[PDB]
Amino acid sequence: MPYIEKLELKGFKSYGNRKVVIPFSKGFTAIVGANGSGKSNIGDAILFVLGGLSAKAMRATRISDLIFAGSKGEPPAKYAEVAIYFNNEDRGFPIDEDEVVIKRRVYPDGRSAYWLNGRRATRSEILDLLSAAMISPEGYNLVLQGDITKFIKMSPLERRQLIDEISGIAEYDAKKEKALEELKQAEENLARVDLLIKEVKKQLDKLEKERNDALRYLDLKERLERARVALLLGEIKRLESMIDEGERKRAEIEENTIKVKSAQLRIQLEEKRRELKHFDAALIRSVKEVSLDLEVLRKEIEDMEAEIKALEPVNMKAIEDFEVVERRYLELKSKREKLEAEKESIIEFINEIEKEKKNVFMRTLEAIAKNFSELFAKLSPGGSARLILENPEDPFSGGLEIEAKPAGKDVKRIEAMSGGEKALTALAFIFAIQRFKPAPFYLFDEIDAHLDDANVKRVADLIKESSRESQFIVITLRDVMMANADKIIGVSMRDGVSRVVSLSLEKAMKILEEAKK
């Protein structure tokens, strides 16, 4: 994780127009000074520079009254400006730099302005990058005045969400979401195929009926034509036994009426022979070998011609149209089943994600609860306390509550915490998370305001131990807290401005027992 190398104020609250550079130990730095030395405005500075639009939380009546209103010896500032410098040699910030520098400036008409590493940035870019570096998750690591009370009135449902962040389930939620995209696509496709199958299946059945009519029209057509060739082979045998004597009548009846109609008998005859010279040989022989009797053939032809007139109209495209629509039918039935299997598969995957997600949540949730127990016993010896999941089966729709028991005292949920018990509990929680997933820094202004000495000593020890992996910036006036800091920054007021001096254990001792009279 990154960490604050220093902080610069120009024109900010109680600090003058002079730029002010506040350097920070990588571990435990302690801001100390008397009531109203303005030591706490440094906390407010940090919230200001992290894009805090909080107004009340920066303890200015309005956004513009974060600006030096002027003092006896210095003119009012033209604006308020804070620059914060992070060491990024670990690349917690998605920036290919080891120093990420964020400067924010607010003008008297309320407008702000940001910069990372000198280029103008918008607020959503500063915010999204501070999130990527998990700087201040829900601001749990920024504990300003009144935050403990805000955290105690906090609902269980409001408490879980920070555990989600810490556990890091977002990566599973990104996968799940693309899985649900593909599932959505999968069944709209699937629904398209269903609508195509319904029409195609109905079109196919028109075509089955037309196909079959076209087929029997075909059969009738063919029988009708062989019968036509049949009636015709007979039609000359008869006409052949006719002219055998129908022109033999000539040399018997004499005045050439018999020459004319026997030239008719020969004139119909000739051509109803040559007519079959033009019929195919396969047809002519698949009939040359069946019946005769001419008038039954003409009655039967008249019939066959009639039931052809029945079926009409027929659509002969149907015979080929059928095949094509049936292939389309069988393929839609094929596609559907593959779509439907694809859908089921996506569903199984989406269920794998949720259960992975939940496991990561519970593993995180249980680690922190173990930690929470220990540390609270450490701050209130002989005591214990418990994190409680509201919905053990679907944690993501439940809240998360706390219950504590101080040694020989009554079990209370966080709702009903009041004295410094409220504070020691809030700090067990905070430290529980910090041992699982250290934030880059923690900011503690006051929080010792309501603990006795024996308490503040264990907190300072706890802070001192944890600083081996996290940065601690504690704004205090209690000597025991001062005692373990690696660095002490002093903050005092002369003639209406605040000043910061890089101090010393016993110097700070002196100044903070002289001011206590």
Residue numbers in the entry: 1 to 254, 907 to 1169
Publication excerpt:
Multi-subunit SMC complexes control chromosome superstructure and promote chromosome disjunction, conceivably by actively translocating along DNA double helices. SMC subunits comprise an ABC ATPase “head” and a “hinge” dimerization domain connected by a 49 nm coiled-coil “arm. The heads undergo ATP-dependent engagement and disengagement to drive SMC action on the chromosome. Here, we elucidate the architecture of prokaryotic Smc dimers by high-throughput cysteine cross-linking and crystallography.
